[PDB]
Design a protein around this ligand. Structure first.
Ligand SMILES: CN(C)c1cccc2c(S(=O)(=O)NCCCCCC[C@H]3NC[C@@H](O)[C@@H](O)[C@H]3CO)cccc12
Ligand code: NA
Ligand code: NA
Ligand code: NA
Ligand code: NA
Length: 527
């Protein structure tokens, strides 16, 4: 079986699994589900959700509980149970950093500050955050990560595990960097030539970066640390490896230290890409509920040099519709956090209550992509795709003729598909033209892939999709030529029925149920 690999070409990206583009329709467990006895509280949710990939931690403390004494009993059970359910895995290496801290490091690491030193603040006080300049800390992490990859090289020949996250939400809360003596000698020294050359900057940290020197130095040493662990593992088994970011608010971030300083935040991606060339991608962990902020994050993390992977998102209802713009940007995956029944909710980040209705909000949007996952993945890499979500958030208690026209206008989205445009509208009947009022709660979205100049693959959810010509036609009229509902079977299109009459007179109207359409448009002469 070919190794999984992240391909980047012509500003576009694909996660190759078993030799073809793949989309992670994921779920991540809660943080304490990384034990054989927890797995029975994970699989039922994964099945109800229709997820094709599970993200789950493997902690340094569990595989190396005493220095040099490795224990992979958890990984064995996990691999076997995942294979029985025919799902893939993303392993999350919880090690030097998990949410800025060494809590998942073994006791012999996290209780031995002199061997494995912490960030020191400017006032001499210590924070519970391991210094990225700790050379012993890097050697020890790297050694254990190598043993994990050696386990997968020997025990996972078919690559049940398709990708590994190196650390979890690196960085530091409460300070901008390490101000220890060890760190201060590096800060006061010259910025490395390799970084000065990659950013095309004149050649110390204070000298070249001014007001940003402290935050860029921490981002740099953390990125170098993560890059060395990653090379060490990839030398054993060259799987896709990525880092997940504790995001700063892209519109009003506040100061580094109030957000996790040093992580792959939107102001330091240029440092991260220069310092960590062996890390495949930098992934946003999204817990902003509001459409404008999430849209800004997807825009910031979708780059020619950065495949979009929504490595975590909140598991509350409003988050499910962000799958559509994720995929529309060419994203490789989407992974709601806390999808297990281990009696924990991360509300107010996620759902207040975890039940079947919490799962069902993601299951309903996964049901649109699962039936075409391989076809969609190839179209997003090789061609043109689009995706949108309902752009107004649910009406707040605070907020509850003119405001109705304003909302109808905001709930109307235009997409340029070449010779044709689509107009996507939310929260209206399946007949006539009464203007959009939005879904309660906000939930709708749409996917479109171009098959040919006049032919699109369309699936949507609680929305109307209407096509029209992109450019003024000259003495010509236009019509839908044919709408077919169907499915892909062994890579071939199988028609179930033709949508026509009422089903195409008022756009293409979608409810909560899955329907995959092929839409062929035509301009025709009336001369
Ligand atoms: C909203 S914000 O972007 O401003 N920051 C507040 C969010 C606090 C940190 C979020 C942690 C989050 N990602 C890492 C997971 O392992 C897990 O800890 C999870 C929370 O359940
Ligand atoms: Na893609
Ligand atoms: Na056009
Ligand atoms: Na146009
Ligand atoms: Na169908």
């Amino acid at each position: 079986a070919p190794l999984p690999e992240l391909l980047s070409n012509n500003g576009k990206h694909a996660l190759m699994v078993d030799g073809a583009p793949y989309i992670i329709l994921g779920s991540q467990t809660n943080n304490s589900s990384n034990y054989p006895d927890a797995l029975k509280d994970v699989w039922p949710s994964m099945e109800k959700m229709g997820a094709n990939t599970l993200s789950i931690p493997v902690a340094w403390e569990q595989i190396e509980p005493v220095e040099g004494q490795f224990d992979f009993s958890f990984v064995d059970v996990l691999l076997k149970e995942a294979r029985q359910r025919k799902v893939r895995l993303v392993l999350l290496w919880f090690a030097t950093w998990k949410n800025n801290a060494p809590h998942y490091a073994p006791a012999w690491v996290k209780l031995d500050n002199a061997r494995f030193p912490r960030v020191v603040k400017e006032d001499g006080d210590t924070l519970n955050s391991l210094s990225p300049l700790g050379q012993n800390t890097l050697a020890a992490d790297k050694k254990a990560f190598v043993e994990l990859m050696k386990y997968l090289a020997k025990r996972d020949k078919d690559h049940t595990v398709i990708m590994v996250q190196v650390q979890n939400e690196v960085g530091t809360y409460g300070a901008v960097r390490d101000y220890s003596p060890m760190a201060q000698a590096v800060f006061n020294a010259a910025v490395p030539d390799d970084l000065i050359q990659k950013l095309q900057l004149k050649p110390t940290w204070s000298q070249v970066f001014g007001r940003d020197a402290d935050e860029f130095f921490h981002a740099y040493q953390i990125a170098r640390y993560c890059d060395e662990v990653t090379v060490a593992g990839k030398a054993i088994k060259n799987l896709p490896m990525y880092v997940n970011v504790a995001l700063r608010n892209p519109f009003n971030p506040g100061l580094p230290g109030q957000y996790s300083s040093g992580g792959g935040t939107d102001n330091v991606l240029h440092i991260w890409k220069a310092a960590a060339p062996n890390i495949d991608l930098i992934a946003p962990d999204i817990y902003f509920r509001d459409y404008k902020t999430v849209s800004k994050v997807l825009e910031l993390y979708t780059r020619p040099d950065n495949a979009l992977f929504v490595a975590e998102i909140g598991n509350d209802q409003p988050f499910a519709r962000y799958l559509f713009p994720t995929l529309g940007k060419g994203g490789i995956g989407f992974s709601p956090f806390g999808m297990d029944d281990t009696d924990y909710t991360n509300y107010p980040l996620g759902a207040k209550v975890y039940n079947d209705e919490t799962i069902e909000q993601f299951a309903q949007v996964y049901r649109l992509v699962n039936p075409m996952m391989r076809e969609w993945a190839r179209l997003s890499y090789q061609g043109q795709v689009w995706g949108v979500a309902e752009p107004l958030d649910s009406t707040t208690e605070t907020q509850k003729e003119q405001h109705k026209k304003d909302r109808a206008s905001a709930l109307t989205q235009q997409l340029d598909l070449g010779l044709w445009d689509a107009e996507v509208t939310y929260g209206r009947p399946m007949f006539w033209v009464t203007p959009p009022e939005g879904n309660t709660p906000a939930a709708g979205g749409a996917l479109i892939a171009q098959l040919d100049d006049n032919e699109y693959l369309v699936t949507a959810y609680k929305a109307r999709v209407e096509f029209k010509p992109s450019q003024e036609l000259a003495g010509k009229k236009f019509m839908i030529e044919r709408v077919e509902e169907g499915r892909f079977e062994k890579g071939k299109w199988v028609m179930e029925r033709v949508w026509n009459g009422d089903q195409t007179d008022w756009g293409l109207n979608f409810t909560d149920r899955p329907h995959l359409l092929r839409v062929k448009m035509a301009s025709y002469s009336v001369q």
